[model samples]
Structures are given as C-alpha cells and as structure tokens.
Target: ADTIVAVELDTYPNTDIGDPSYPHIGIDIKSVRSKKTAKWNMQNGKVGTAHIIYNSVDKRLSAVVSYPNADSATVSYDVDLDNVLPEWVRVGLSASTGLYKETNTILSWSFTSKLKSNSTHETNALHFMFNQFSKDQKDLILQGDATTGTDGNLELTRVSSNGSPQGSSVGRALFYAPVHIWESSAVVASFEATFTFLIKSPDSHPADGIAFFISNIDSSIPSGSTGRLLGLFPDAN
Candidate 1:
C-alpha cells in the first residue's frame, strides 16, 4: 500500500488593505540537512489546493496550487536537490498588510500521508497533523543556536521584531525532527506534501516578502540570505 498525505483549506478569508484582499497559504519542510516551502494565494473566497511531491530516486520537490474546479493549478514550482531530504515540515499563514489590519481565516483543513512500498517497515518518516507542541516538545523537535537566535526565537508567535526605530525588524523560526527522511545512506527519499496558510500585511507596502527555501545547511542562517535572496540564493560578491 502506498501511504499518502493530503490537506484541505476551507472557506479561508482575505483581509488586507486592498478591496479584494490577496491571501496566501503554504507549507515548509525543514531539517538540519535541507529546507523547502510552497504557497498559494487568491482573492477572498477562492478555494484552491497546494500540492507537493517528492521523488526519492530523483531527489525532486514539485508543488502546485489549483482552484476547486480548475483543470490545473494557478501556480507550480519545482526544485531539484540532487539527493538531499528534509527531516520535518511546517504549515502556517502569512500576509502583507502594511499598516492596515486584516483577518484571513482558514475555515477548515486536513492532511493525509502516503507511504511507499518499501517504507512499510521504515520508521524514519514521521507525520504531524493538527498537532500542538509544548515547550519540551518544541525543544526536542527543533534545534537552535547562537546564529539562529535563542530557543524562543523559533516560535510562531511573531514574524516581526518587538520594536524598532523604523518599526521594521526581521524575525525567523525553524522547526525539525531529529530523524532523517531516509535511513539508508545509499538511497534518497522523495516526498509529496501540502498545506494552507494566510498572509496579511498592514497596507500595500508590506515588508519585502516572505520566502520558502531549501538548503543543505542547518542551525546557522546565512547572513546574506535576506532581502532579494529570499533565503534561497546568496550574494554574488
């Protein structure tokens, strides 16, 4: 039996500055070894699916977001990671509201995980759906260091800093499990995952933008990965 995971977002809201708020939803797969993210956005009351697939043999990550009754997704993206795999994944909401306030709601959602034939006996792959984490659980599952900030820095409570002269600050969080996606060093694992999230900024001039990235480095965030890099590419200097 091939194990599979699916997620749905129901009656999500769009609250931002514009007349028709453009909201977004997505997921992040993170690990000490690799990281990746996928997201979709549409006007209010627009239903869509964010789909993802990871091919173990090919070490590929493919994603798509489609409407409820559409023939194809509105957006599609793919990344070839050679042979690296992430250890954990996260689903969350974000937006660009600028100085205005908006409310985006994920009325309902769900997820399903599918396992491969050879994965029946494999204990390396783990899944979390509608799961909550306490302080202890967060500590055990996520890893942090000086470069990545303190343990509390990895929380989902806030995306921006508390206070700044320009009222703009950068905040980041990372989550992962201690296990590897694949057990065998000789074999690479592929994955298919999806989720929904919302993004609401104050006004039209939201900060720069949010990013979903996949990299082989862990614990240490690159200094030049901010702004235009989207945390995926680095400075060319």
Candidate 2:
C-alpha cells in the first residue's frame, strides 16, 4: 500500500509522476503526487539534514531540508495527523531512484514523540521447534491425527484432508500452563504467536481449514466436531 503521508525530496523530478520540478521538496499525501512543494537547494558532497516535525494542536506537518553550508527548503502542510494516521504508527524512511541514481543516507538523527501508550508490553514468550517436540509432549499436545510432518512442522492432520470428512482430525498444541496476559493497568498486555503452518487444497474447494488461537489450558476439545471442524470449537463465539 502507498503511504498515507510522506515527505518526498525529488532531485531528478519526473513530471509523469506529478513532480513539481527538479530538486524540490514535496509534501506528499495519499499518493506520489505532492500537494505542496518548495524549491530545494540540495548541496553536493556535504552532510545534509532533514528535520521533520508534526504539531498536534495546529495539525501541521513540516519538513526542513538543509545542509551546513547551503540554502534550505522548508515545507509544511496542515493535516490532521490523528485522522491521517492510526493510533499506533510505523514510522520509517523509504527512498527510490529511477534510472538516474543518487545517494541518500542519514549520518545521525534523534526522534521524539509525545503519544499515548495503547497496550502494555508483556513478557510471556515461547519459542520451540516443531521437529523437536517429542520430549515436549506434556507442554505441547498433538491430539487426534495432528502429528508432526517430516520437517519442523506441526501437521494438524499430517495429510491433505481437502474436502473429505474421512481425513478429519483434531490437534492441540498448548503450553499446559497459564501464561498471564493481563496487567494491573487495566490493559490487555500485548502477546504474539509466531509459528509456521501449511495447508494443502488440491481439490477445487477447501472444506477444511485450520485456526491458531489462544484457549484455556484445561479446556478440553469437543468430541463431535471432527467432520467439518478441527475439534476445537464447541460454541460459535
């Protein structure tokens, strides 16, 4: 996806992409096309700097591009950052060069933001290889026909069940112990599950699928959900 907001410094401007002109500072939003632009005086063979800032009260995002001994360009735009960005934002820089190439690098930088914290960070993390799960049977349970494949994979059925109830199976891999997910700050602590899985559907339609979720350690898998289910869901939540 293209960025919702951006600061584009165009040295070799391409009017085909809607650049203002050569060596310009463009305040881009939603597309590569810049809504506002300023003539840039980029210095060659010298350390250049870009100071980008966003004011919360006035909703102004500004960028000041300059060199130690060169003329600078200041470009700002009135944009409601709250409306343009999400609660939590992934901020970074990206550059692209056409057939004409140029070097863009940051020697040193510092960033500060006064934003609200959304979720508390939790330290409950688990990492294990699926191939070495034999001794971890107590903590990682492989119920029904959900065995391990030849590689480091926890095969839910260990076979392509596709659209048939004949290859139906149930598998459960759990920690067997409670991992606290809530903190005292009235916030659901952040937790993540990172594992690789594979599913094959050679037939036209896939009648069976898999679900990776978090459930109670003592909760038992329902018995009569094998045909069309993965033997986990007892209630439609």
Candidate 3:
C-alpha cells in the first residue's frame, strides 16, 4: 500500500480525520491524508492547470496549480522517490467523486521523466501471446510447474480456482536465455515492457496474483514458494 503516490485536488472538507478546514491541494502518499496541504479551490467553472514535477537532484516533488482568474496555489514536499517507488512504474491520472452530485474533468495531461540509460538498446524487446499448442520451442523457458492451459494462458497454479491445497503452486516462464542488461561498453541499457494477464479465484476469497519477473537464466524457484507470496522471494528463517 505504500507504493502509491498522488497529488489530489481535494474539493470537499471532511476534516474529522485530518483534512484541512478548507478545500485544498495536497500530496498523498499511501494514505487519504495529504502530506502537505495548501488551500486552493479549483471547483469554480474556470479552467485551471496543474503541474506536478519531481526535481530528482533536489529530491523534491512539487505541485503548482493556477486558474484563469489569477487564483493559484503552490504546494511541495521534500521526498526521494527512490525510497517510495519501484525502479519502474506506470503513470496515469484519475478524477473521481462520491455519493453527492459533483463533476470533475481533465482538459489534458503530459508527463516526462529523466532516466539514465543507454539509448542503443531500446530495440531489445519480447512479445508473447502464449498461444495454445506450441512447446514454446527455443524462445521461452518454462520453469517450476508452469504449463499452458487449453486457452494458452500461462497457469501459475491450475489449482487456484478450486481451493485445493496443492503444494508448490509457484511457476514461471522466462526468456529462454539472458538478454541485454548491460552492453559491452558497460552502459546499463534502458528497459521497458508491458503485458496483459488475468487471475481467477473463487468469488469469496481471491489469493496469489501474478508477478512479472526478470531474473538469471539458471535461477530456480525457492522451496515452499506457495500462497500469497506470489511465488518469489522467500522469507529468511
């Protein structure tokens, strides 16, 4: 739950549990309570723009919101994002409201980030449909008990749907061999990937989701990698 971060334009004051008395702009990290709040009401029928920027060198994340009628607010917090997020992450924006009738909309959005990587390796990539029938031949390496279902979905654990206590429900399908992580000149290559998957469980309780992993070719599944751990990174005894 701590992996999430957001800049919220909170319009309603439900301050019984630590909201600023006035509608404010704030940054929220892993909780509904914003870390820093500045009173700024953008709810009027006026076009407003917000810019969220992270100054990596300064280790600061800041937000600046301005409206057409010369009303604006600036709020910021000192944070090193490396401590709060994974190396790679997805970025998007959202606007939502509750039972009372209100409307929120975004005119447009844009984002940019500074990354340290070799641009030459941008072409290195893989795409897999995991279609039903082929043994995956030489390109895909199936590890542990991973197997393709009749529909070609990579079944991490076929027992997930039936509530059976099948031991070692962990599985993995990796690239058949090691790919470019570092180039011959010793520059770390830039990496990006995307995929779609689904996990099914009984309606009452759902457990053990999917994980996208990149690892060494000879790595083996850790013993007793079952249940909600998602089949990776066993705890030290």
TM-score top scorer: 3
- Who is ahead in lDDT, 1 or 2? 2
RMSD of 3: 13.8
- Give the candidate order by descending lDDT: 3, 2, 1
Model 1 earns a TM-score of 0.47
lDDT of each: 0.32, 0.45, 0.47
TM-score of each: 0.47, 0.47, 0.49
lDDT of 2 by residue, 124-172 (tens): 3323333243423555555555444323344444344342222445444
lDDT of 1 by residue, 1-237 (tens): 111111212112223211122223232333111132223344333434455566556644555666666544332224343433433334222111122222222222233333344544543344544323344534322321111222322231134343111212222333343323444342445554444433334444333233333333243333443322222223312
Candidate 3, residues 96-127, lDDT tens digits: the string is 22222122222333333334335665343322
Return the lDDT, model 3, position 155.
46
Return the lDDT, model 2, position 86: 41
lDDT of 2 at 197: 26
Error of 2 at 18 (Å): 2.2
Best by lDDT: 3
What is the overall TM-score of model 2 with all chains considered together?
Answer: 0.47
